[PDB]
């Protein structure tokens, strides 16, 4: 299948962030991509990475990154909502591939909510609940 160059760039951005821990580099590189109508894919891939990870490091790092992106007005509310809603749609299959993803997703959603970055509606829509 032909390469989706922007999915690749988003995945590379997120992996560079997990490996370096550099939140500013991640934010700068996302802005340089100039893809504000595809930020839902950044959210989607980020959350998939949390679900596919081990230990607590990727969870916290991706939490802090989405916190900063929201709070800095880098991601619009429509793009935030679409990214989470995409995860909510695909979680049955992600959970088959990675058991207990419903529980991880739920903890992630609860922490996002506690951080002030998603509506109570969007929280409530999480299918783990």
UniProtKB/Swiss-Prot annotation:
Whole-protein residues included: 322 to 448 of 469
Tissue: Expressed ubiquitously. Highyly expressed in thymus and liver. Moderately expressed in brain, kidney and spleen; weakly in lung and heart. Expression is up- or down-regulated in response to apoptosis inducers. Regulated by many programmed cell death-inducing stimuli.
Keywords tagged on the record: Acetylation, Apoptosis, Cytoplasm, Nucleus, Phosphoprotein, Repeat, RNA-binding, Tumor suppressor, Ubl conjugation
Domain comment as written in the entry: Binds EIF4A1 via both MI domains.
Entry's transmembrane regions: none
Claim: Nucleus is one of the keywords in the record: yes
Changes after translation: Polyubiquitinated, leading to its proteasomal degradation. Rapidly degraded in response to mitogens. Phosphorylation of the phosphodegron promotes interaction with BTRC and proteasomal degradation.
Principal subcellular localization: nucleus
Function in brief: Inhibits translation initiation and cap-dependent translation. May excert its function by hindering the interaction between EIF4A1 and EIF4G. Inhibits the helicase activity of EIF4A. Modulates the activation of JUN kinase. Down-regulates the expression of MAP4K1, thus inhibiting events important in driving invasion, namely, MAPK85 activation and consequent JUN-dependent transcription. May play a role in apoptosis. Tumor suppressor. Inhibits tumor promoter-induced neoplastic transformation. Binds RNA.
Disease implication from the record: Decreases benign tumor development and malignant progression.
Cellular location(s): Nucleus; Cytoplasm
A GO-annotated cellular component: cytosol
Gene Ontology BP term (one): positive regulation of inflammatory response
Subunit structure, interactors included: Interacts (via MI domains) with EIF4A1 and EIF4A2 (via N-terminal domain). Heterotrimer with EIF4A1; one molecule of PDCD4 binds two molecules of EIF4A1. Interacts with EIF4G1. May form a complex with EIF4A1 and EIF4G1. The interaction between PDCD4 and EIF4A1 interferes with the interaction between EIF4A1 and EIF4G. When phosphorylated, interacts with BTRC and FBXW11.
GO MF: RNA binding
Family: Belongs to the PDCD4 family.
Name recorded for this polypeptide: Programmed cell death protein 4
Keyword Repeat: yes
Organism per entry: Mus musculus (Mouse)
Domain MI positions: 5-127
